[model samples]
Target chain A: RRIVLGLIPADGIGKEVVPAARRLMENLPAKHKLKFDFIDLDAGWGTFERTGKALPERTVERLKTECNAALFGAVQSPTHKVAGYSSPIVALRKKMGLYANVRPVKSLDGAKGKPVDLVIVRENTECLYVKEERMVQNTPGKRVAEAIRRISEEASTKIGKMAFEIAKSRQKIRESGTYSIHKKPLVTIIHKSNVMSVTDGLFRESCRHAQSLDPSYASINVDEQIVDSMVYRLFREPECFDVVVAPNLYGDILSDGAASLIGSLGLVPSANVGDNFVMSEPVHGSAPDIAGRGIANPVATFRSVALMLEFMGHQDAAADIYTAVDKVLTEGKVLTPDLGGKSGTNEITDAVLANI
Target chain B: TRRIVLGLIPADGIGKEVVPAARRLMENLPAKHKLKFDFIDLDAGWGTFERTGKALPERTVERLKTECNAALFGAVQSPTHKVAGYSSPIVALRKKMGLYANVRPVKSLDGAKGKPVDLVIVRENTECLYVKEERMVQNTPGKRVAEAIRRISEEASTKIGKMAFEIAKSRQKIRESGTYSIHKKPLVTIIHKSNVMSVTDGLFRESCRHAQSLDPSYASINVDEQIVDSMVYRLFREPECFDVVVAPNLYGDILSDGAASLIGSLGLVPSANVGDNFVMSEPVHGSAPDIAGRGIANPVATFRSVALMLEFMGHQDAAADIYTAVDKVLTEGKVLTPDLGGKSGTNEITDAVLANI
Candidate 1:
């Protein structure tokens, strides 16, 4: 099968890392026969400076029309607000109907605090991300700003359904004796319904409905935690969690906090999954200071490539990529600076390639 | 010349067990400091609510307002389910007393499990989702939808911001005086999600910045902003990098408990609800009903709360004495309660602190 991959290395170290990810996928082993076709796309601060658009029409059009899967490298955010520019990724997710951001954070090695493998499924579409805000002057001198937090039944159900399915699949992997850390599949819905009895109340109620609607999730263990208590539990007992699903805002905060547990933020990978399309990206941002140094960690992007393949029904090929990266990490050599090693981008990429 | 009237309200469970531990420490304040204490035992909590049908009785509020300017509150157990007409006395007390800012200080001792974390989280008490302005909506058949308004007013934010800066200045003074030399400089981190809630958190962010111009003392204090999510991430990764964290109501409530996890136990964390004229010290942990009568409850949180109350009531030297005594007991690692992984009971731990004093 031929897999078409669109590479959008929008800014800074993105330009260095996305190419390394593309190289690893091209050199995959021959067991699960797969051929690759690559498409280069541009969208970032540089693109915005040249053309008045951060994300151009052609980039979005090609990904939607031509590519089977895509990898999004980071974009540089302007230090100060520029008049006519916005983030391309945020716009892209909305434009492409990518609703759930699935971020999987796993430590490569087993240390005390490092033995964690969990995925935070963030509802990317709605909640406070809607950004419907306005200023009110009802109190005369004391101005009040209000932002509407929208939680829809449709969006909650969609993300909730995916979370349970992901849990079931993780359970299968554990049951197969391949992944043994997790014995029971768990879906923890994180919310603050005690205080937010309406918006988050709808979120909690709707998500539970979606879980009950599917028979596949019947055996899956389900639980809920208030957002505050969830953070405390997340730090205290990270091993207790498996699949954590949250609304847009809570998920964004949680995934980042969860990433701090395993290793460097540069080592985390995420996939923006929609109904028909899935776009994988690194959780770390564009490191402009080290753009051309060739020392940027390629592990996050490499893992992103595997995530895209897994969602594309290429699990065998994806598993091969995961095992190769795991071997390189376990070896603890040919490592990048972010992972406490002196190796450069080419050295790490070469190591993964050799393992394959 | 006037004796300090301390109202002790040990409401439920182990609260009844630990409040006396605080009282003993206060009464033992060094005679050289010329500090005298008059204790007035008050009634409030779940137990009081069940009997009187009121969580915070009029007598408690009237005495706190008219009789005592400072108080120490013990924890109360919320009902299994929502109890009709029985709201939390602590919430009602804060409102009635006009306690606008809840100040929580979480510090890792000289030698703790993790690195040293000395952070004072100043949470705005009045506004945000705690307003409880919730309503039920039947948007579809067999589905119930609810939304509580999260309000951020310029006035409340400005007041809380000023309070945070004042606390930051006081902390800096304490550090520079060589009394508590943990934080080198004061940094007021404004915690908000302005990226998403551009209107609500935006106002909160800007108001904190405006507070810098309120007093010249605030100018020497550094200011920065972190999205509430990243704040939690950084709070664990690089805790030493933070000094004073000022957040909205809900964010502060969550951040405080999360910070407590870094340090050994919630029983070691203390909070002070401060208004203009009155202050109420409260332990960060709740009343663990399971271990209520066991007498093994930790009293360090309550002890530290009394010190916080003394400091706010203009007894800095006395407060420092209490803090030093608590630190000595913690560092010695003897006579600790079960929460601290020791076999000592509440009275033994209190005696250890009293002996050190």
Candidate 2:
């Protein structure tokens, strides 16, 4: 099968991780079988400066018409006061209507000793697009601030159904679950209907409909918890839960909190799905603070590439690649600066490939 | 209005002992204000459950609201009862009387029996994510589900926000209000996430600003807004700078609990819901079944609630009198609950309050 891929070697540390992912793919056996082609594109901080625009027309053109699936390294957000550049990563999803933000949060056991295990599926494009709605309260001083949360019946329905489906598939391994004790998938919808009744009320309404029609979820245990206290309970009882489903804003906070719980901000991976089109990138973020020092952990970006392979219907290869990455760390041989090792980026990447 | 009426609902075992202490102090306060309380006998908690199969009765609730300025409530949540489904009388009082502003002023009672925590939270009592934490029961595990939560209204905003600002106005930095010239305008930082749901929280902010417009005394105030997560960090680092912080019900619940780490015990904290027509006060705690009837239960929060009631009833001097007496008791540090590193009995607190007042 011919594979068409969109490759964005963004800016800053993004440049560093890009080669790590490419080098991993160059050595993989799956690459030989799947006749692959890489189409490099520029669409981040540097591109914005050169073209006097954040996401240039040429980059949007390539993403829109050419690439079947996209793999991004990372986007640099500057500290300059001139409305710091937000990369096209967000715009690409919105412009292309990539509504589902699928994020899997877990550390590789062998290499990075998994700290916590969980998957979060977020409703990305609909709720709280500050660009769409202008809201101001009728008070004096009349602080004119605007925010829009559009939870169309369609957006809520699709995202809710996807989360419930994930819960059924990833129940329990050997030890976990106090109630039901059954290895059934668990889905939880986190919102603020108690505060934001209209938007959140609709979000909850669609989740109810999706749960009712789903049979795999028929005997599957599902519940709704308010957004605020769920943060407390997650820390108090982290093991009892499995999967969390949330709208755009709550999902954003939970993703960051989950990242912190596992480890530092230097290593993480994330993905977004819009039907046939898929995009994958690291969650560690471009650390402009420590960008050019060659001290970043690129394992997460590499893992993100594994996630992309799975999204492309290469499941066995994805699983094997991820396991090999884990093996490299679990054996205590390859170590990077972020992972408390004296080794650099090349040292860790080479060991992971050897493990594979 | 001349006679201060205090409703004593010493609900259960320890409540029975500590409540009479409040009554003693109320009775002994100087006759200058012409103090009087027509003792209306009432039943509450498990006592009512055993006699009438309900934790609260209609007759008791009716009498409690119309007759009294405030109450001295103690020790809810029976070990035998579940917190979710039980007929919690406090919840009924809040809903029945429209008590919108739940004010829980927290300060480390120095020389008293606890850790040093100096901050107050004017929590919006009427609405938010708090009501969503009720329950979810399933017939066959999943499928159809329903969740209920009520949010927004102009009336709720007027009461809750006004309460916080008014407290900041009356509060003093030192014993003599005129002497200590610290910027008495303790900032009222509203915590919200308007970026997410603008409609519900948007109305909340509108109501606060509307109230601010009518009152000029609030102009010098360092009023600000912040997201909930950021507020948690600031609250821990510089709690003293925060005079009175206001938040919605759900955020309040999480924040109060989170800040509990700053102070000593949940048992020592007192909270009140102050509305125009009605007011109610209770300890910000759950049923500690472990120490139910051990006489180790601390009644400091209940006493603080009683002190708040005195102020609400126009007995301002008597309120200050009670405050001084509390400081003296904590000042002596002879007797305190086990949480305060002492093994004092329940009656010792009453004796100390009576002697000091």
Candidate 3:
């Protein structure tokens, strides 16, 4: 079967990453019998500078009409607010109906002593992220800014169901020959209900109801933690966690924190998922410092490419890619500069590709 | 001065145990600092609330405000489920006394693991969710919803921010005098969640920047901002990069507890709730019901709390002696309680500290 992939190498080190990913895809392992056709897309800071649109309509139109799945490299979000300019990836997630942003942080053989593997499933669409803000200024030089923090049963239930399914999928993999640190799937519901009972309370209960929607969910362990304590326990005992689900803001915080647990953000991968569409992206930002040097770590992108394939029903090919990447990481020779080795991007890419 | 009338309120559980430990150290503190003490025993907490239906009695608040310049508070407990007419006395005490700032300094002891982290968290104490303006709306018969307004006023933010900047400058002075040695440059990291709760946190962030504008050397203090979540993440990754961190109530409460994790045990952390009139020192460790009567509950946090109170009360020399003695005992890895991985009891640790002083 032929897979149509949309490639958007947005900006900075993304420029280096997507080309290496393109070369890796051209040389997929033979057993899966799959072929890829690429559709180059335009979006990001470079695009905005040239065309005044961070995500051009053509990119979204082409993805919906022509592509089955895609791999996003990274985007350099503007540090300060800009007129007529917004983050392309955030805009893309909303426009394409990507409700869940799932990030999995895993460690190879040489990471810190603990076996580190956990998935943070963040509700991508809503929470304080609604961005509905206004100013309350009655007195001169005194002002208060207010933003609507939305927590609805509809959105909460949807993300909760997605978390349960992901847990089941991980459990199914465990039942098979896949060696995993997680023996039983567990979903830790994170909230701040003790304080914001109306907003986060609705979020907490909706997730509980979503789990009970399936009788089989009983087999999977379900627990809850207040967000602050979760942050503490997450650092103190990360191995105790399996799948963590939260509202948009908490999820964003937890995902970023979880990424730090592993050695580097340059090695973590993420996927934006919806009902029928999945767009995989590296969790790290486009490192402006190492953009043109060809020394950017390619492991995150390679894993993300595999994540994009897995969501597209190419499980064997995806597993092959994951295994090959892990092999390269385990061997610890011919590594990228980010991984504390002298190997350039091409050398690391060649090492991963050769293993595949 | 004839007498330094110090208020002692050991409210519940091991608080009853540890508060006595703190009192003994103060009475035995070297007289060379020229400080005389008069102790007024006070009552507050769940134990008092159960009998009197008041967590913090009016008499206790009056004495704290009128009779004492500084006080050392033992830990207090709240019922797991809320009790009728019962709230945390410490929370009430802070509001009643206008203790607007909760200053917690999480410093790693000598021979501690990882990087030597020394940073102070100045938490806005009076407002935010601690205001306790909560309402319950019944969605269904059993299923209910709770909403609490998170209030951040311009006045409180400005007050707390100025305090943070002042502390930042004072810390720099200590570093310059070589009295205290922390390697990093003095910094005040304003922590907020402006991306979401822009109104509350935005006002908080802006007011802090306004405070910086008040003084020219507030300029030399090296100010920065961090989103609350990213602050916690980076706190673990590069704690040494920080010097003094300031935040609103909820974030400050969580961040201080999280920082306590960096230094081995919560039993080693101390905080002082400060105001213009009074500074109340408190052990960051809670009332341990599990080890209530057991002498194994560590008193180091309480001892440090007493020292912190003395520092804020303008007896820095006395405070420094207490701190140095505590550090020597801790680093000696002898005469430590169970929390510090030693076989010694509270009295033994206290005696080691007193002898060193």
Docking class of 3: acceptable
What ranges in model 1 sit over 4 Å off? A138-141, B135-138, B142-147
Any runs in candidate 3 off by more than 4 Å, and if so which?
A: B49-54, B78-85, B127-151, B193-202, B215-219
- Give one digit per residue, the lDDT tens place, for model 1 in A210-267: 8797788899888887876777888878888899999987898788788878767777
lDDT for B173 in candidate 2 is 32
Kindly report which residue pairs in candidate 2 clash with one another. A110-A329, A110-A330, A111-A329, A111-A330, A135-A146, A268-A283, B111-B330
Candidate with better TM-score, 1 vs 2 = 1
In lDDT terms, how accurate is model 2?
0.67
Worst 10 residues of 1 chain A by lDDT: A107-116
- CAPRI-style class, candidate 2: incorrect
Error of 3 at A136 (Å): 1.9
TM-score of each candidate?
A: 0.96, 0.66, 0.93
State candidate 3's DockQ: 0.34
Rank by DockQ, highest first: 1, 3, 2
DockQ score for model 2: 0.10
lDDT of each: 0.85, 0.67, 0.83
Error of 1 at B227 (Å): 2.3
Please report how far candidate 2 places residue B280 from its true position, in Å.
3.4
